[PDB]
Design a protein around this motif. Sequence first.
Motif, PDB file in Angstrom:
ATOM      1  N   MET A   1      -2.280  14.003   7.947  1.00  0.00           N
ATOM      2  CA  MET A   1      -2.470  12.566   8.117  1.00  0.00           C
ATOM      3  C   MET A   1      -1.222  11.917   8.699  1.00  0.00           C
ATOM      4  O   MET A   1      -1.315  11.040   9.566  1.00  0.00           O
ATOM      5  N   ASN A   2      -0.043  12.335   8.236  1.00  0.00           N
ATOM      6  CA  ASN A   2       1.198  11.770   8.756  1.00  0.00           C
ATOM      7  C   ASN A   2       1.343  12.050  10.246  1.00  0.00           C
ATOM      8  O   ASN A   2       1.697  11.159  11.026  1.00  0.00           O
ATOM      9  N   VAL A   3       1.070  13.290  10.661  1.00  0.00           N
ATOM     10  CA  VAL A   3       1.254  13.638  12.068  1.00  0.00           C
ATOM     11  C   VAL A   3       0.202  12.962  12.940  1.00  0.00           C
ATOM     12  O   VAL A   3       0.511  12.505  14.048  1.00  0.00           O
ATOM     13  N   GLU A   4      -1.045  12.879  12.475  1.00  0.00           N
ATOM     14  CA  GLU A   4      -2.115  12.254  13.235  1.00  0.00           C
ATOM     15  C   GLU A   4      -2.268  10.791  12.823  1.00  0.00           C
ATOM     16  O   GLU A   4      -1.508  10.260  12.011  1.00  0.00           O
ATOM     17  N   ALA A   5      -3.268  10.130  13.404  1.00  0.00           N
ATOM     18  CA  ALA A   5      -3.613   8.764  13.027  1.00  0.00           C
ATOM     19  C   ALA A   5      -4.369   8.810  11.707  1.00  0.00           C
ATOM     20  O   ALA A   5      -5.433   9.431  11.612  1.00  0.00           O
ATOM     21  N   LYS A   6      -3.824   8.154  10.684  1.00  0.00           N
ATOM     22  CA  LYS A   6      -4.335   8.261   9.326  1.00  0.00           C
ATOM     23  C   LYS A   6      -5.115   7.031   8.878  1.00  0.00           C
ATOM     24  O   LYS A   6      -5.337   6.862   7.677  1.00  0.00           O
ATOM     25  N   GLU A   7      -5.532   6.167   9.804  1.00  0.00           N
ATOM     26  CA  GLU A   7      -6.320   5.000   9.412  1.00  0.00           C
ATOM     27  C   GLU A   7      -7.691   5.415   8.888  1.00  0.00           C
ATOM     28  O   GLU A   7      -8.132   4.949   7.830  1.00  0.00           O
ATOM     29  N   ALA A   8      -8.381   6.294   9.618  1.00  0.00           N
ATOM     30  CA  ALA A   8      -9.681   6.773   9.159  1.00  0.00           C
ATOM     31  C   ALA A   8      -9.547   7.549   7.855  1.00  0.00           C
ATOM     32  O   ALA A   8     -10.384   7.414   6.953  1.00  0.00           O
ATOM     33  N   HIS A   9      -8.503   8.372   7.741  1.00  0.00           N
ATOM     34  CA  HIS A   9      -8.280   9.106   6.501  1.00  0.00           C
ATOM     35  C   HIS A   9      -8.038   8.153   5.340  1.00  0.00           C
ATOM     36  O   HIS A   9      -8.554   8.363   4.238  1.00  0.00           O
ATOM     37  N   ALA A  10      -7.254   7.098   5.567  1.00  0.00           N
ATOM     38  CA  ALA A  10      -6.999   6.122   4.514  1.00  0.00           C
ATOM     39  C   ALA A  10      -8.281   5.409   4.105  1.00  0.00           C
ATOM     40  O   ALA A  10      -8.512   5.168   2.916  1.00  0.00           O
ATOM     41  N   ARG A  11      -9.123   5.053   5.077  1.00  0.00           N
ATOM     42  CA  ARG A  11     -10.386   4.397   4.748  1.00  0.00           C
ATOM     43  C   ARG A  11     -11.292   5.319   3.937  1.00  0.00           C
ATOM     44  O   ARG A  11     -11.905   4.893   2.946  1.00  0.00           O
ATOM     45  N   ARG A  12     -11.388   6.587   4.340  1.00  0.00           N
ATOM     46  CA  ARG A  12     -12.196   7.539   3.587  1.00  0.00           C
ATOM     47  C   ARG A  12     -11.646   7.735   2.181  1.00  0.00           C
ATOM     48  O   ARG A  12     -12.409   7.829   1.212  1.00  0.00           O
ATOM     49  N   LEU A  13     -10.319   7.801   2.049  1.00  0.00           N
ATOM     50  CA  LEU A  13      -9.710   7.923   0.731  1.00  0.00           C
ATOM     51  C   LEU A  13      -9.975   6.693  -0.121  1.00  0.00           C
ATOM     52  O   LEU A  13     -10.178   6.817  -1.330  1.00  0.00           O
ATOM     53  N   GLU A  14      -9.966   5.502   0.479  1.00  0.00           N
ATOM     54  CA  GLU A  14     -10.301   4.297  -0.271  1.00  0.00           C
ATOM     55  C   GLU A  14     -11.742   4.341  -0.762  1.00  0.00           C
ATOM     56  O   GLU A  14     -12.030   3.965  -1.903  1.00  0.00           O
ATOM     57  N   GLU A  15     -12.666   4.791   0.090  1.00  0.00           N
ATOM     58  CA  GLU A  15     -14.055   4.924  -0.344  1.00  0.00           C
ATOM     59  C   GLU A  15     -14.179   5.922  -1.491  1.00  0.00           C
ATOM     60  O   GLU A  15     -14.878   5.666  -2.483  1.00  0.00           O
ATOM     61  N   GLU A  16     -13.504   7.067  -1.374  1.00  0.00           N
ATOM     62  CA  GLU A  16     -13.542   8.062  -2.441  1.00  0.00           C
ATOM     63  C   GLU A  16     -12.932   7.512  -3.723  1.00  0.00           C
ATOM     64  O   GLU A  16     -13.424   7.788  -4.822  1.00  0.00           O
ATOM     65  N   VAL A  17     -11.853   6.737  -3.601  1.00  0.00           N
ATOM     66  CA  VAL A  17     -11.222   6.139  -4.773  1.00  0.00           C
ATOM     67  C   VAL A  17     -12.169   5.152  -5.437  1.00  0.00           C
ATOM     68  O   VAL A  17     -12.251   5.087  -6.666  1.00  0.00           O
TER      69      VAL A  17
END
Lengths: 82, 214
Positions: free
Chosen positions: B159-175
Amino acid sequence: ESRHLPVLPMTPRIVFEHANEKRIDTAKRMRRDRRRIEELKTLEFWGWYMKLQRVRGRWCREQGVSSRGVYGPAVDAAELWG
Amino acid sequence: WQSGVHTPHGVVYRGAKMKNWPEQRIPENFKFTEEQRFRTKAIPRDVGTIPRNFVLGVLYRHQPCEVGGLWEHCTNDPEIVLDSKRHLREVLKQAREEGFVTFERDAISNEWLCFLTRERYEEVQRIVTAKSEAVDTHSGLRGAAATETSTYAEKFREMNVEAKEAHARRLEEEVANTTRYLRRFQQREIDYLPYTDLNGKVNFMWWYETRDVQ
């Protein structure tokens, strides 16, 4: 006239000035240390009062005492008088 | 508070319930008389260390925080310690008075956006790091799965190396899903006791626990 180092002869005025300086320093030191002692006393008293409040809270929790009148938790839930 | 009277029926806050407070149904026909509603008061809420730390962490996560956005983020977060929007507003006011939060009328939108004071940003970072380290050290189960921890570290690096906006959104949904699943069983109870300080000001001592409804 003379070439020795500048030395003030001991006179009543000079000794009185030295006594006044020492008295002023003594008063300042006395008041400063008194203030320090009072600050320590206040700090330790506040700490003791906080410990007392913690003990009271623990005891009230154990005994089921809410300290919010004879009413049950329903009044607090209503929040119409808190 | 009660859902049926202080809010329109059907409104429920998924925060931290108060200990021993009974959730009692209220008839739909209920309505206050205007004078009584004006005279009504409110129980004081906690504005101290834990609530301010939670709010500061939420703002640290979402630096740009709108009103509804901030409330939704707080609800989504699993470390919820607040009880209601009134408690949230009181905590925000306390933080503002301390000099942590700043409110600005955004040029793009009329909504009032929130920022964190740069002087206090270092303090916020230290608080967040300390809380994360404390949670990591306290969690007994954490670390039992070395493979899982390594995979999670790899995910962090990806996530750090790539664009992590989508990952952050998915993690928020999972949270959010995990928080709902947790709320199904457990709940964070709040227990408070009034006391009088030496100054003569009545205050409240609070402590938060976790209870399993099961």
